[PDB]
């Protein structure tokens, strides 16, 4: 249930 | 340095709602929501693959994060993370949301586990360092905690003296919080710690928590591992990290206590690694 983090953080 | 002085509290001379409880003693289950910027050294160790919480941790400089060794390495459970398996998230309050313009997400350069971490027996020397790839920018929400000197450790690590534990772990031994949780807990006499468990306790551990007859409750739990047990020095008003959430038998059980890595006792190793 964790919000997707920016893809730039790998 | 400027360690242990919180931008949203000590730096502007505001007190948080329970820090006085700690001072009055210097003579997460059953915690509360943290205030914004209450624990600006709090770090979340975050798994990349199944995107999930792995552990708590703490920020001790712009490039170094402290955690429990068992957060990274515990062979009995087939745990052995490498640097690339995870991220550290710094400046957080909400457990699950990406906190845009507030949190900073850092990648790991290198993990260092204490060479005599006893994962085979009793989690003796349950301590690890993580060097970040890039320095993190300090902010109102991101600021390092101090590590104790011998004198601060001796003066404050006394039975009855309270410290504070924070994390995003389970609220019960068998739900999860929307935001970072906090609880103040008293350090316990070493004989009472020893008599509460079958595990062999060492001088690199201490325990904390209320006794059954004291009425008040609270404990760390699964998911809080690696997070800080901190104390606010009455001498210089700075927060010091005395412990690391290590282990416990269940969570908030009557007659049981939470065990914490004794940071001061392992500080020579910490400095050895940082000096490189
Ligand atoms: C690696 C590990 C292995 C076993 C346990 N469980 S345990 O604490 O009973 C324990 C500690 C030391 C040696 C053990 C050997 C055999 C079986 C259990 C052991 C453990 O708690 C952890 C660490 C862990 O899972 N910590 C999460 C946690 C954090 C805080 C608490 C708490 N304060 N109640 C409880 C649990
Ligand atoms: Na208890």
């Amino acid at each position: 249930d964790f919000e997707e983090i920016p893809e730039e953080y790998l | 340095a400027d360690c242990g002085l919180r931008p949203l509290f000590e730096k502007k001379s505001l007190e948080d709602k329970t820090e006085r409880e700690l001072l009055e003693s210097y003579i997460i289950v059953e915690g509360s929501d943290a205030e914004i910027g209450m624990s600006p050294w709090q770090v979340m160790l975050f798994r990349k693959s199944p995107q999930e919480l792995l552990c708590g941790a703490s920020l001790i400089s712009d490039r170094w994060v402290l955690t429990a060794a068992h957060c990274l390495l515990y062979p009995p459970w087939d745990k052995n993370f490498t640097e690339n398996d995870l991220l550290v998230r710094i400046g957080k309050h909400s457990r699950t949301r990406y906190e845009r313009n507030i949190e900073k997400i850092s990648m790991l350069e290198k993990i260092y586990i204490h060479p005599r971490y006893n994962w085979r027996e009793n989690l003796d020397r349950d301590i690890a360092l993580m060097k970040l790839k890039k320095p993190v920018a300090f902010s109102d929400y991101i600021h390092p905690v101090c590590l104790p000197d011998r004198e601060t450790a001796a003066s404050l690590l006394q039975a009855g003296y309270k410290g504070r534990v924070t994390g995003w772990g389970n609220l019960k031994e068998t739900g999860q919080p929307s935001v970072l949780q906090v609880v103040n807990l008293p350090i316990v006499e070493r004989p009472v710690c020893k008599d509460s468990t079958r595990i062999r306790i060492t001088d690199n551990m201490f325990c904390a928590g209320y006794k059954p007859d004291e009425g008040k409750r609270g404990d760390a739990c699964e998911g809080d591992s690696g997070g800080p047990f901190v104390m606010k020095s009455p001498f210089n008003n700075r927060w010091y990290q005395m412990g690391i959430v290590s282990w416990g038998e269940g969570c908030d059980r009557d007659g049981k206590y939470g065990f914490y890595t004794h940071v001061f006792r392992l500080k020579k190793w910490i400095q050895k690694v940082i000096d490189q």
Side-chain angles (χ1 to χ4, degrees), chain A residues 1-6 8-10, chain B:
Chain A
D1 55 341
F2 280 88
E3 183 171 354
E4 189 57 43
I5 68 168
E8 68 189 84
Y9 298 123
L10 238 52
Chain B
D2 200 44
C3 72
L5 298 170
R6 299 173 292 178
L8 289 182
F9 295 98
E10 285 79 19
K11 294 219 215 157
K12 325 150 67 136
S13 198
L14 293 173
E15 279 176 17
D16 72 53
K17 288 157 190 148
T18 66
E19 58 168 275
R20 210 103 224 183
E21 175 176 3
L22 309 188
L23 181 59
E24 290 162 359
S25 67
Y26 306 152
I27 59 158
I28 307 292
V29 183
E30 288 291 328
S32 293
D33 290 357
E35 295 168 63
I36 298 298
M38 184 182 230
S39 187
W41 35 79
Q42 188 79 207
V43 171
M44 183 187 285
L45 294 199
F46 193 70
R47 196 176 191 164
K48 290 197 195 166
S49 59
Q51 269 197 19
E52 68 191 347
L53 170 77
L54 285 185
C55 266
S58 65
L59 188 71
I60 61 168
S61 86
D62 61 0
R63 286 171 275 264
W64 286 98
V65 170
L66 185 64
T67 192
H70 82 255
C71 286
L72 302 171
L73 171 69
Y74 192 61
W77 293 348
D78 299 300
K79 184 185 294 187
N80 192 346
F81 293 109
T82 54
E83 290 77 1
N84 274 221
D85 297 336
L86 67 126
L87 297 166
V88 300
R89 304 177 69 173
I90 310 177
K92 292 193 59 53
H93 177 76
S94 173
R95 182 173 65 80
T96 58
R97 165 116 202 278
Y98 176 65
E99 289 172 295
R100 188 164 44 97
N101 295 6
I102 297 160
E103 72 168 284
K104 301 299 171 203
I105 301 197
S106 299
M107 297 188 295
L108 306 182
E109 179 162 311
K110 191 75 172 131
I111 291 159
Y112 305 82
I113 305 180
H114 193 295
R116 313 186 51 199
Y117 162 50
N118 199 343
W119 54 266
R120 291 181 170 282
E121 187 199 348
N122 60 349
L123 306 177
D124 200 17
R125 313 183 195 79
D126 193 9
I127 194 168
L129 284 158
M130 291 174 291
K131 190 175 188 190
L132 309 182
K133 267 177 195 177
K134 288 174 177 151
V136 68
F138 301 162
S139 78
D140 282 354
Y141 318 99
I142 297 169
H143 197 88
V145 72
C146 308
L147 298 184
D149 45 72
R150 176 171 297 275
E151 295 63 54
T152 297
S155 45
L156 293 183
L157 284 179
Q158 296 191 47
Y161 286 30
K162 296 176 177 179
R164 169 181 288 174
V165 185
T166 44
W168 292 280
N170 299 349
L171 300 163
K172 301 189 182 169
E173 194 185 308
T174 38
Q176 317 244 258
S178 38
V179 308
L180 181 71
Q181 295 295 290
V182 54
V183 64
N184 303 324
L185 300 166
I187 292 160
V188 173
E189 289 89 355
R190 301 195 67 78
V192 178
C193 295
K194 289 182 189 188
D195 286 351
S196 76
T197 180
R198 300 181 59 169
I199 303 297
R200 183 181 64 90
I201 309 315
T202 70
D203 287 350
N204 308 308
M205 307 175 187
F206 70 87
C207 94
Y210 293 102
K211 299 162 186 199
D213 77 352
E214 295 181 323
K216 283 194 231 194
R217 312 200 63 75
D219 201 7
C221 204
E222 181 179 341
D224 292 325
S225 292
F229 178 104
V230 300
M231 303 183 77
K232 183 175 171 159
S233 169
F235 310 103
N236 66 187
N237 291 153
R238 292 177 185 252
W239 295 85
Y240 284 93
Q241 176 173 177
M242 311 315 301
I244 302 164
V245 182
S246 187
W247 59 276
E249 301 171 17
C251 306
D252 198 36
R253 293 196 193 155
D254 279 5
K256 300 298 191 159
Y257 302 91
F259 283 78
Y260 303 82
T261 306
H262 195 313
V263 168
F264 174 66
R265 290 243 341 154
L266 299 168
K267 194 173 168 209
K268 281 206 153 83
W269 173 79
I270 294 175
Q271 199 60 241
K272 210 200 93 138
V273 169
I274 286 167
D275 292 351
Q276 260 139 323

